[PDB]
């Protein structure tokens, strides 16, 4: 079937070329860019002990969750720089944390092969573990809450999995990736999702159907970063090849490349603003090189982190950008 | 408002209770001295030597691809590299894994303890007559002067184990930038825990000397 699989790979890449037309860099070249942003470090969220391997914001955009390999999980109050609900973790090495949209439940997960969910608003006022979602044979790398009871989890066993807290088991398993899957993103209309793995591919998924519908094979290296465009009709991924590229769901190809020749470092966290024309990508040169997101113009450098920025996310209403990094502090950007 | 002031007072009180908790288990955590092993989920053996915590991490359940979860262990005290010491060609897989760990841009800051765990298993294979074909420069290798483990040990076993040691240490010296140092060993061996203690002592000593730029 190896001879057969090359034929539909050649047929799909011609369907990209049949809809190649004009690229996004040529069309958007006429209109005015936003120019230089000059984001500044509003608030430094100090208190994490080891490297901050993962973070997530909230729908309320006030509380953010951030996960560090010390064994902690602090729901940071980003408006006043306050720590609320510092979860002590069973696993010392946590690589994911999704702040639940509703806000009641908080995920974690990592090398323990368990995505453990913590309910913040317990009846006793002390945060405990609701259900430990064991079942993955690989490391938990990204998690995203569908709602208060549904949580798809990216994992290192080449399979993402949709779980249910009420039963503690997998609703469905997404067995399409061929390498250990790194980042995860849910659409704003929460009907479908796309996850990036350590492949050349970041293939799209369906929540209710449970399996891959379209595959976006655009990066050279390990896609550590993924985030939808704010409509949900597109998404940008980021990998270790020092290029982050955007892909459209209605299309099938790479849109246009956000790369610069000075960048010789990997990408770990991409995130999108309220408007689509801004892309916050987090890099391995200890900075977050933000782009214009439509013109390959580096809109700014979010320097100020001494170690590698491993998780940068933006607020749901577009207020701020908080880039957690490996130097054990998050920083709020505006 | 007064209700806004009431919520911020409770938020600050919960924050200072959390700060008290995080000072307490910062005092726990900095005394932990985590290590990483190679060669469910992640396994924990919190062993104490000389009233010093050492929080070992066997990570066997993660699969063969390890390029992204080995980046968990750049802030670790040490990467205890267990080598099967016998040569699929599992020993050269350990050399390539050590070369991948050594030259990794995050693991450049953290040190590796090498142990060669199946050293007692190595003695039957080399005395029977099997690494000469598996390594061409073993013929051209010579034994160093500081190479006496024990007088009853055969010089062929000593030459083989020191060739395997400096086969890792060719990666440790001949490299680019990176602030980290290798501690090879030769292992029933009840002295291994002590060897981990002395090597992590020298690791955190060297980390403080590099913090003073003494290295």
């Amino acid at each position, epitope marked *: 079937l190896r001879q057969e699989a090359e034929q539909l790979k050649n047929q799909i890449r011609d369907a990209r070329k049949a809809c190649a037309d004009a690229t996004l860099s040529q069309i958007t070249n006429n209109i005015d860019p936003v120019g230089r942003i000059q984001m500044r470090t509003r608030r430094t969220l100090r208190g994490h002990l080891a490297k901050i391997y993962a973070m997530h914001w909230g729908t309320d955009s006030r509380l953010l969750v951030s996960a560090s390999q010390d064994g902690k999980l602090i729901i940071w109050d980003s408006y006043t720089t306050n720590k609320v609900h510092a979860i002590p973790l069973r696993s010392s090495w946590v690589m994911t944390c999704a702040y639940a949209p509703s806000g009641n439940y908080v995920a974690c997960g990592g090398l323990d092969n368990i995505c453990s969910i913590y309910n913040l608003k317990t009846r006793e006022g002390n945060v405990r573990v609701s259900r430990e979602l064991a079942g993955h044979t690989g490391y938990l790398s990204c998690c995203r809450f569908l709602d208060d009871n549904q949580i798809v989890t990216s994992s290192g066993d080449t399979t993402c999995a949709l779980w249910d807290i009420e039963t503690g088991q997998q609703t469905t398993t997404f067995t399409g990736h*061929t390498g250990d899957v790194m980042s995860l993103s849910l659409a704003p209309d929460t009907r479908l999702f796309v996850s990036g793995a350590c492949d050349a591919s970041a293939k799209l998924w369906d929540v209710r159907e449970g399996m891959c519908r379209q595959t976006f094979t655009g990066h050279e290296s390990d896609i550590n970063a993924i985030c939808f465009f704010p409509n949900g009709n597109a998404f940008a991924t980021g990998s270790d090849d020092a290029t982050c590229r955007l892909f459209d769901l209605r299309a099938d190809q790479e849109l246009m490349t956000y790369s610069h020749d000075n960048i010789i470092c990997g990408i770990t966290s991409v995130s999108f603003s309220k408007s689509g024309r801004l892309l916050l990508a987090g890099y391995d040169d200890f900075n977050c090189n933000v782009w214009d997101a439509l013109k390959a113009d580096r809109a700014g450098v979010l320097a100020g982190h001494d170690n590698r920025v491993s998780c940068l996310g933006v607020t749901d209403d577009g207020m701020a950008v908080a880039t957690g990094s490996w130097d054990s502090f998050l920083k709020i950007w505006n | 408002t007064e209700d806004q002031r009431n919520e911020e007072k409770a938020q600050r009180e919960a924050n200072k209770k959390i700060e008290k908790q995080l000072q307490k288990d910062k005092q726990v955590y900095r005394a932990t001295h985590r290590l990483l092993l190679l060669g469910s989920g992640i396994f924990e053996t919190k062993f104490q030597v000389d009233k010093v915590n050492f929080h070992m991490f066997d990570v066997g359940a993660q699969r063969d691809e390890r390029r992204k979860w080995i980046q968990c262990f750049n802030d670790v005290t040490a990467i205890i590299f267990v080598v099967a010491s016998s040569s699929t*060609n599992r020993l050269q*897989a350990a050399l390539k894994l050590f070369d991948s760990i050594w030259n990794n841009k995050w693991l450049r800051d953290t040190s590796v303890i090498l142990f060669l765990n199946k050293q007692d298993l190595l003695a039957e294979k080399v005395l029977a007559g099997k690494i000469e074909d598996y390594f061409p420069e073993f013929a051209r290798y010579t034994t160093p002067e500081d190479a006496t483990p024990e007088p009853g040990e055969d010089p062929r076993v000593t030459r083989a184990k020191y060739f395997i040691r400096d086969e890792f240490l060719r990666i440790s010296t001949a490299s680019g930038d990176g602030r980290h140092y290798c501690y090879p060993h030769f292992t029933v061996d009840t002295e291994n825990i002590r060897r981990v203690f002395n090597d992590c002592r020298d690791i955190i000593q060297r980390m403080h000397l590099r913090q003073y730029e003494l290295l």
Partner: nanobody
Amino acid sequence: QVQLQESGGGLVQPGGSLRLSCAASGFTFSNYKMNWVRQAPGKGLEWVSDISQSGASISYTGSVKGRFTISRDNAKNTLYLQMNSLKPEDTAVYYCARCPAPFTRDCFDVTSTTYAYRGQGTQVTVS
């Protein structure tokens, strides 16, 4: 698409020269450290050789160190591997394992099972 179409192999007598090549398109060849990994049936994935960017650091496994040489072509975007004086022990399935991150001197998981930047492979049978 990063696809890795290897070429070469076949029924070749031991001691006879063979040119191993992989197509290796979809990624920038000048940035990536490049690899060769073999896998015998019932043995497992075994690393053979690596070449760095522009051939700076070239190391070999000890089975083939005195008898193999590896070359790469940055302009033609193609990795090569000469084989000379073959014993019949290395009848393995050779596979042009590519290192995952380009600008890093390290190279993980090219002997890992179901690796994404590893080709389908060409059967190299010697008898």
